[PDB]
């Protein structure tokens, strides 16, 4: 599997000040790199995709660069909504991994949170007001506190095709239900280390950049 690490992962910085994040990969990534801004109630939206482009919205004063192994993700004026922790992710082998993180500081429905006993299992949900559910991938993004997401898997609403993150195979299963525009995602047998927040994103046009998010949904073991 393919790694990626930001080297920083943590920077304070001032209001227009210039801040460029790193992001290297263990091996070619043939420019098929995200970055992902994650606010700190949470929300996360795709902001650059395959390397350089900005997603509609974005304002100029982001860009990004990169080739082969190494990338970078720069604000040229840092303003205060630029608050939040920034994640790079690679699109060039599955299963889609992502970068530890850089938190910047100033010097989809889914269901509700739940509290499980170890051992139990939980199916959340994510419903899609989206009319291109059951044409699109709705992906699943594991956040544990401070570390790398990591991505689940992934199913096709249109005829139930999945792919896994093999290390997930064994503790997750996703299904979705055209009628009701709703996937879900079943997770076995709790440990401590399963408590996290789980994330359903969407993908379509770019299989491997997640354009649309839902809000997470807060998983916790007793």
């Known amino acids: 599997d393919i790694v990626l690490i930001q080297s920083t992962s943590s920077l304070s910085a001032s209001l227009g000040d210039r801040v460029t994040i790193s992001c290297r990969a263990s091996?070619?990534?043939?420019?098929?790199l995200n970055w992902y801004q994650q606010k700190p109630d949470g929300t996360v939206k795709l902001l650059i995709y395959?390397?350089?482009r900005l997603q509609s919205g974005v304002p100029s004063r982001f860009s990004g660069s990169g080739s082969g192994t190494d990338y970078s993700l720069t604000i040229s004026n840092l303003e205060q909504e630029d608050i939040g922790t920034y994640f790079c992710?690679?699109?060039?082998?599955?299963?889609?991994?992502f970068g530890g993180g850089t938190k910047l500081e100033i010097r989809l429905q889914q269901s509700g949170p739940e509290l499980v006993k170890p051992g139990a299992s939980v199916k959340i949900s994510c419903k899609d007001s989206?009319?291109?559910?059951?044409?699109?991938?709705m992906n699943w993004v594991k956040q544990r506190p401070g570390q790398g997401p990591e991505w689940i898997g992934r199913?096709?609403?249109?005829?139930?095709?999945?792919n896994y993150n093999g290390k997930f195979k064994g503790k997750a299963t996703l299904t979705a239900d055209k009628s009701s525009s709703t996937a879900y995602m079943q997770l076995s047998s709790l440990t401590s280390v399963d408590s996290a927040v789980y994330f359903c994103?969407?993908?379509?046009?770019?299989?491997?950049?997640?354009?649309?998010w839902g809000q997470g949904t807060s998983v916790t073991v007793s």
């Open positions: 091996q070619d990534i043939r420019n098929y």
């Open positions: 199913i096709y609403p249109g005829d139930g095709d999945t």
């Open positions: 395959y390397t350089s």
């Open positions: 992710q690679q699109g060039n082998t599955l299963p889609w991994t």
């Open positions: 994103a969407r993908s379509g046009l770019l299989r491997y950049a997640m354009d649309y």
């Open positions: 989206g009319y291109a559910f059951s044409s699109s991938w």
